[PDB]
Amino acid sequence: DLSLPSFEDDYFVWVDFSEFTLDKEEIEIGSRFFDFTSNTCRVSMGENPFAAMIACHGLHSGVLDLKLQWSLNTEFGKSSGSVTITKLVGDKAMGLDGPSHVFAIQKLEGTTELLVGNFAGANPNTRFSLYSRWMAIKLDQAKSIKVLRVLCKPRPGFSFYGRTSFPV
Amino acid sequence: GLAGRGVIYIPKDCQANRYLGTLNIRDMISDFKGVQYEKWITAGLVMPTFKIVIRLPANAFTGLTWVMSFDAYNRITSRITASADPVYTLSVPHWLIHHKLGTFSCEIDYGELCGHAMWFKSTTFESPRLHFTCLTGNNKELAADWQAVVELYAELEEATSFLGKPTLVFDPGVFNGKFQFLTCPPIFFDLTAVTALRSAGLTLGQVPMVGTTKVYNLNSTLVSCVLGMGGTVRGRVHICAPIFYSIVLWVVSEWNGTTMDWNELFKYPGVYVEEDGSFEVKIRSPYHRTPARLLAGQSQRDMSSLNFYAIAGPIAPSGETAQLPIVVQIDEIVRPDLSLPSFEDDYFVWVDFSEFTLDKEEIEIGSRFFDFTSNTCRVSMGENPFAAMIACHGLHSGVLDLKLQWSLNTEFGKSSGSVTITKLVGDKAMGLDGPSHVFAIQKLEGTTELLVGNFAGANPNTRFSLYSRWMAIKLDQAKSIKVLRVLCKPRPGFSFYGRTSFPV
Amino acid sequence: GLAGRGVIYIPKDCQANRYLGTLNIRDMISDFKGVQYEKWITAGLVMPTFKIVIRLPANAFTGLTWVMSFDAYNRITSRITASADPVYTLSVPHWLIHHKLGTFSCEIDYGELCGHAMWFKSTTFESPRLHFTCLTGNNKELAADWQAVVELYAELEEATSFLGKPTLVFDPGVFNGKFQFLTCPPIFFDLTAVTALRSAGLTLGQVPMVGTTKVYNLNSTLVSCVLGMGGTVRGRVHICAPIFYSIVLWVVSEWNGTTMDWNELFKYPGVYVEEDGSFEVKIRSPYHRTPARLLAGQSQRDMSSLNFYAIAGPIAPSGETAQLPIVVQIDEIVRPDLSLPSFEDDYFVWVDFSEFTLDKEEIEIGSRFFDFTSNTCRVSMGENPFAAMIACHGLHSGVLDLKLQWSLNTEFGKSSGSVTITKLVGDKAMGLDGPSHVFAIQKLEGTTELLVGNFAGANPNTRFSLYSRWMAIKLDQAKSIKVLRVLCKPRPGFSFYGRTSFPV
Numbered sequence A: 001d002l003s004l005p006s007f008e009d010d011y012f013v014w015v016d017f018s019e020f021t022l023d024k025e026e027i028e029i030g031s032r033f034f035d036f037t038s039n040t041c042r043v044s045m046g047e048n049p050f051a052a053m054i055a056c057h058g059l060h061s062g063v064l065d066l067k068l069q070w071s072l073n074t075e076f077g078k079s080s081g082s083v084t085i086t087k088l089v090g091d092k093a094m095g096l097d098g099p100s101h102v103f104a105i106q107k108l109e110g111t112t113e114l115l116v117g118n119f120a121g122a123n124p125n126t127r128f129s130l131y132s133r134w135m136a137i138k139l140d141q142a143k144s145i146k147v148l149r150v151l152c153k154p155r156p157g158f159s160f161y162g163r164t165s166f167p168v
Numbered sequence B, C: 001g002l003a004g005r006g007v008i009y010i011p012k013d014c015q016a017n018r019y020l021g022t023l024n025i026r027d028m029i030s031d032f033k034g035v036q037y038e039k040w041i042t043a044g045l046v047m048p049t050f051k052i053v054i055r056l057p058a059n060a061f062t063g064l065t066w067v068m069s070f071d072a073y074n075r076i077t078s079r080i081t082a083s084a085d086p087v088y089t090l091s092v093p094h095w096l097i098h099h100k101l102g103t104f105s106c107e108i109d110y111g112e113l114c115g116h117a118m119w120f121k122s123t124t125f126e127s128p129r130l131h132f133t134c135l136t137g138n139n140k141e142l143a144a145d146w147q148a149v150v151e152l153y154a155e156l157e158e159a160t161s162f163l164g165k166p167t168l169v170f171d172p173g174v175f176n177g178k179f180q181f182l183t184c185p186p187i188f189f190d191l192t193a194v195t196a197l198r199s200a201g202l203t204l205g206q207v208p209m210v211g212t213t214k215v216y217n218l219n220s221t222l223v224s225c226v227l228g229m230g231g232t233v234r235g236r237v238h239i240c241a242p243i244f245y246s247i248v249l250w251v252v253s254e255w256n257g258t259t260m261d262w263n264e265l266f267k268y269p270g271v272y273v274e275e276d277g278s279f280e281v282k283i284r285s286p287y288h289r290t291p292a293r294l295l296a297g298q299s300q301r302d303m304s305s306l307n308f309y310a311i312a313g314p315i316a317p318s319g320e321t322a323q324l325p326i327v328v329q330i331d332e333i334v335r336p337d338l339s340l341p342s343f344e345d346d347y348f349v350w351v352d353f354s355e356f357t358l359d360k361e362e363i364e365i366g367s368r369f370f371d372f373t374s375n376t377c378r379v380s381m382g383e384n385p386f387a388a389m390i391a392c393h394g395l396h397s398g399v400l401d402l403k404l405q406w407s408l409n410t411e412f413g414k415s416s417g418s419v420t421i422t423k424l425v426g427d428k429a430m431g432l433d434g435p436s437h438v439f440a441i442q443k444l445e446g447t448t449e450l451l452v453g454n455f456a457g458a459n460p461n462t463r464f465s466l467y468s469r470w471m472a473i474k475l476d477q478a479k480s481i482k483v484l485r486v487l488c489k490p491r492p493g494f495s496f497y498g499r500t501s502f503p504v
Helices: A049-055 B025-032 B035-043 B218-223 B385-391 C025-032 C035-043 C218-223 C385-391
Strands: A012-018 A025-030 A042-045 A057-072 A082-089 A101-104 A109-116 A133-139 A145-154 A159-163 B002-010 B019-024 B049-055 B065-071 B094-098 B104-109 B129-136 B146-153 B187-189 B196-201 B213-217 B228-239 B246-255 B271-273 B277-282 B304-315 B324-338 B348-354 B361-364 B378-381 B393-408 B418-425 B437-440 B445-452 B469-475 B481-490 B495-499 B501-503 C002-010 C019-024 C049-055 C065-071 C094-098 C104-109 C129-136 C146-153 C187-189 C196-201 C213-217 C228-239 C246-255 C271-273 C277-282 C304-315 C324-338 C348-354 C361-366 C378-381 C393-408 C418-425 C437-440 C445-452 C469-475 C481-490 C495-499 C501-503
Touching: A049 A057, A057 A082, A082 A109, A101 A109, A109 A133, A133 A145, A145 B437, B002 B019, B002 B025, B002 B035, B019 B025, B025 B035, B025 B146, B035 C035, B065 B104, B094 B104, B129 B324, B187 B196, B187 B304, B213 B218, B218 B385, B228 B246, B246 B277, B271 B277, B304 B324, B385 B393, B393 B418, B418 B445, B437 B445, B445 B469, B469 B481, C002 C019, C002 C025, C002 C035, C019 C025, C025 C035, C025 C146, C065 C104, C094 C104, C129 C324, C187 C196, C187 C304, C213 C218, C218 C385, C228 C246, C246 C277, C271 C277, C304 C324, C385 C393, C393 C418, C418 C445, C437 C445, C445 C469, C469 C481
Parallel strands: A057 B437
Antiparallel strands: A012 A042, A012 A145, A025 A133, A057 A109, A057 A145, A057 A159, A082 A101, A082 A133, B002 B146, B019 B129, B049 B104, B049 B146, B065 B094, B065 B129, B187 B324, B196 B304, B213 B501, B228 B277, B228 B324, B246 B271, B246 B304, B348 B378, B348 B481, B361 B469, B393 B445, B393 B481, B393 B495, B418 B437, B418 B469, C002 C146, C019 C129, C049 C104, C049 C146, C065 C094, C065 C129, C187 C324, C196 C304, C213 C501, C228 C277, C228 C324, C246 C271, C246 C304, C348 C378, C348 C481, C361 C469, C393 C445, C393 C481, C393 C495, C418 C437, C418 C469
């Protein structure tokens, strides 16, 4: 006799960035779904079953749809700059240019896809270096942002390989 | 088999409105204890079909009529224990017990009338009661105090599910015209009067009152779902007096006052009532319909009414003094001429927040649809049929689509911050993160879904703590908002369990 | 379903003959209380078929064997509460509980084993008990005290009659040769002995004793109905020790002593026993039969015996010290060679009255067959199988034909008066007059019938007061009588209910 599912087929919180100390901020994502750290801003990671499933398997692979939302710290009338989504294939150094995307800060939201995977087919739950698509979020007026929230929603067929555990 | 029992004590002078007592259904079964009680301990959960039997010496010489009121959610108890107004006792499922008919019996499908299964060891939500009150009094006191015996018969078996089948599913465009448990408080005729008139208003969407207390109930709530109604009122009339009292009534419908000419009166399409029975009277009106509710300054008598004219009697032997009571029950509007539904399948107002005093404001919603309170801002709650339906059932469950709208208090160019919708599973302390959502204040509007429910399947109309999804609205620049309006629109299949009432 | 329950506490050191406790069957059901208990209250009378289950952790390393004794008429309780001699515990219906087999179960048809239906509100005759005793002890103490759980399962339904079906109907010429509940007290072998002999007497009519106390029981009583028996003893042997104990036995029958020559011993027709199992051994005797009871100064070894020769072992690892116990059960004499019945279908002695001190003497019998006492004369009671059968059942009922005989103490020519038989229905005080009968003393003999029973249908083997026919013998010249002898002969169909025992 089961209850409703706790989650619907909807977005859920991946990460919130807040309390920026520098106007220039660049968050590298690459091709991974993982826990962020920053010396220059406050990272608040989401806790949900998807994140646990990532942690409790050896390998995973799929596509995430992202929704970015943000609110202003300064007066709207004074605002300038952008949330830019850099999309490459390769790396920052030698990469090819994909569907990179400039959201004027006044849009206050934006969307993008993220490939979680690589040429081999799947990501371990650790740092690794395997040729793939590459994503980054670039802030140029980060001190004018009170919060940058990133939600994700896995596209159907997001796959996990080898059940295991994850002590923290 | 016999599952439980109890005793109601009747005073020798049992007058109208006397509170006779309350039996606690679960205590009746556990004090008896009980082949059925013991089967219950093993089942854990039961969803009984009860036969209630009230043993009662039949007597045609008293005029006594009592009401048994099934109050599964303990909603009227507080307010009937000093004296029981019929408006309270008839606002929940109930049965008329006529002294002339003696021993009384009825069936209670606990799955319908209540909606949640009974746990052997303790009350889950509230403790289910049977109230016994006197609707019409004895014509003169009896010889001595006496008692009646109440008995519960059931074959208890283990319940498969926690929830029953929903008594009602929300739909704006659906009020059939059929009623259950719609009983009008007693109408009285003096025997010192050669003729008389008693009006019963037909503006059925009006909320009944007892002094300053509003008694919300499902029937008036249902009628309010429509703009007005025409057609024929089908009902039953009970004459609640001793065999030696008698009366003849002309029952007819009239619009805005009554005629003063007896000849005109009898050119109307009415019916004669000499005794207990059913009746059909056409709702009479210049528009063929009477409005569902009143406007300001209007009276129920300005519209269509069901009028009871005593044209012969009442008579009784000397020296009787008691009035002769008529109890009317309305069963349905047959051959109905309905107005438009009052609401469409659209959003309606849940709540407005305004006059914020702090820039940081956090409104917890959780998994409930309810009335907000705040020390730091002004809450204005919406009043509509949906909110009444929530109030007139023991349990409900469904999903609400929300639209948030807001206007600014400061200059647009100076604006900053957000309306943030936190969505969790669990609670603020240990919850999991769902589709939380940040609306930059400049969006000026946003949407979200709200689950009204929990792991068990339904919410009571009180505060409770049951693991579920959890929602909150977070303002960071609240003083920059002139108003935050929250509209909702129930998704199809929003369910209500166990019809009841709600006095405020 | 589960009807009642109880708990037995076992000591970490559980030795042979430890009393473990008594459960009261009706208290088990009423303390539980009990879907079955509540069905019982409505039925009034129940004649259950119980499944008794003893929950018990199986263990092959202890050697523990317990006995559950069904004592429906409370006959051995007084005698076993300090220490339980197997002669008592095995004298009523009983079951061996082997620790190696774990959880134990059996059926009790209360109709057979008891005979009267149970009244919900109070004990009718005596209160039915289950006794738990240790038959063979543990080889060494266990780690800690523990407990076992006793459960009663039954589907109680209303009893149609007060009385069950009779376990036994009196007949002198009928002892089949089949037994139930014939268990011999444990036989023990020392492991400090390379070989050994243990004899079991086959003189089965002998009444068992515990010190100076005779323990009358149905089995010995049955055997006493015959002069002697030959044939083959079919039984079962239980080896009641840990898996690490083992033994090999040569089991054979011998007459008057035992041979001292091992080679002769193995030319006899015996069987080997290495483990739990059944056995058949021919009863060996010069006459092909062994006598049912002993004469004066005869010993049970003087006749045919069932001999248990340990020919290898017992052995056990060091340093075990416990003896190895063998429990023998005798099921029947197969291919029986029976003697004449010891009694024919004839009268036998009930009582002699003699040495009268008063001329007026009145002996009340009522509706009972029982042992008389007098302060004014000498009572000499008869001892025979019928009397033992009365003593070894909870209830009995039937009709006795009486013959009275008497001889004179004074000169015949001087004699006067009568032996009068008063026959009433009721009691001396308010009774109705039946076939009372005046025998002039010169008749020197007379006859009458006696109903042994009452309105309920059967008599307990105690004093009771239940409306029935009532008999008394009245002497008016008692000092003129040298002896008054009363013989009886049960009419066909004299019935006994619920086999039990009777320690004196």
